[PDB]
Design a protein that fits this description.
Layout (H helix, E strand, L loop, with lengths): L4 H4 L1 E4 L18 H16 L7 E5 L6 H15 L4 E5 H9 L8 H4 L3 E5 L9 H10 L4 E5 L3 H5 L9 H8 E5 L7
Parallel strand pairs: 1-3, 2-5, 2-6, 3-4, 4-5
Helix pairs in contact: 2-3, 6-8
Length: 183
Amino acid sequence: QKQAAISERIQLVSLPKSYRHIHLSDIDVNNASRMEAFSAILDFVEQYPSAEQKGLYLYGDMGIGKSYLLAAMAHELSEKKGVSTTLLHFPSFAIDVKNAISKEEIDAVKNVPVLILDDIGAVRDEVLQVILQYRMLEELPTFFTSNYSFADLERKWAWQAKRVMERVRYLAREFHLEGANRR
């Protein structure tokens, strides 16, 4: 069955191919926190597109499936709606873009309908800051995953710019996720 069309609308940047094949059914909803996060992911898909529709900032322990949950949202957005999503592993994007001595690097990322910035934290205030700034003005839904909460993420960054953190809080609502996912 040539239903690999919804899968191709999901652009990946420094992430294994499996992140393009994650369905809502693969997500465990066996916690109060996962019930809440899953609930918000379904509202987003159902209400897309909305006025100033905000993304989600998912944080919690490493390896529990925070990125998977968001990948499942991207898969459902491509299947129900026809929207493209980009899942990007920030730590790798930062380093690969840092080598700006050469392309389509950040332009293919800042204007996508829905952008997922995987495990932010752990680059500068010149690339992320501008991408976020542009998505704020353009009203483009932006999500994030991290090992740190808002307060902890900021308290880890450096003086610093500090306004990059205000853009994160403006673009996404914080959700603490607990419990690993099966697989």
